[PDB]
Amino acid sequence: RYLMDPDTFTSNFNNDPLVLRRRQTYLCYEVERLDNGTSVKMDQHMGFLCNESGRHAQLRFLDLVPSLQLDPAQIYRVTWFISWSPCFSWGCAGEVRAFLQENTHVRLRIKAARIYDDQGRCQEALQMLRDAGAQVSIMTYDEFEYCWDTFVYRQGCPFQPWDGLEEHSQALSGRLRAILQL
After folding, report:
1. N or C, which end of the chain has less CB nearby within 10 Å?
2. What DSSP element (H or E) covers 29?
3. Residue among 31, 28, 10 at smallest CA distance from 19
4. How do the residues of the chain divide into helix, strand and coil, expressed in percent and rounded to 5?
5. Do β-strands 135-138 and 106-112 pair in parallel, antiparallel, or remain unpaired?
């Protein structure tokens, strides 16, 4: 099971708002079955994806859903830890929205390291994700450290936060919440 290089993680998940990092998107994913009150994980149902040749990571996750062989009779929670949202292209959120409409046994939780508020398409795309049932939030220390511990080739090294991580996360979270306020 393949683990990310540590500089790739740090370079892509850094939440400095003064950086406009839109070239790549890294999406770390885990799928759990909701049963017996608890959650049940599957290690072959965890991994990470980047954009590959114009096909956004979010779309690459949707392409591998069949290979997950989800029992349509059960409820599943898919979590994404994604370096930024929402997916920039037009209708790429629409493809996510559509997948959620056709797979009503799947609940999608999106934890983004950052968002880019353009006061336009970006806000509308985030709202449409919410409206299709996704739960979108901004990553905090706990989630960066989880992803470090879970997806990165860290060789026993502990997570080392960058300067401003918590301040930046709280500022982004405030703005996402404002956008998504019902």
Report:
1. C
2. strand 26-35
3. 10
4. 35, 25, 35
5. parallel
Whether 66 and 106 have beta carbons less than 8 Å apart is answered as no
Query: What was the resolution (in A) of this experimentally determined structure?
Result: 1.9
**Axis-axis angle for helices 121-131, 165-180 (nearest 10):** 70
At position 4, the amino acid (one-letter code) is M
Give the list of residues 6+ apart from residue 114 with CB closer than 8 angstroms, or none: 15, 17, 83, 84, 85, 138, 168, 172
- Pairing of the two strands 26-35 and 38-50: antiparallel
User: Which residues face 110 on adjacent strands?
Assistant: 80, 136
Q: Cβ contacts of residue 1 below 8 Å, gap of 6+?
A: 43, 46, 47
Paired residues of 40 in beta bridges? 33
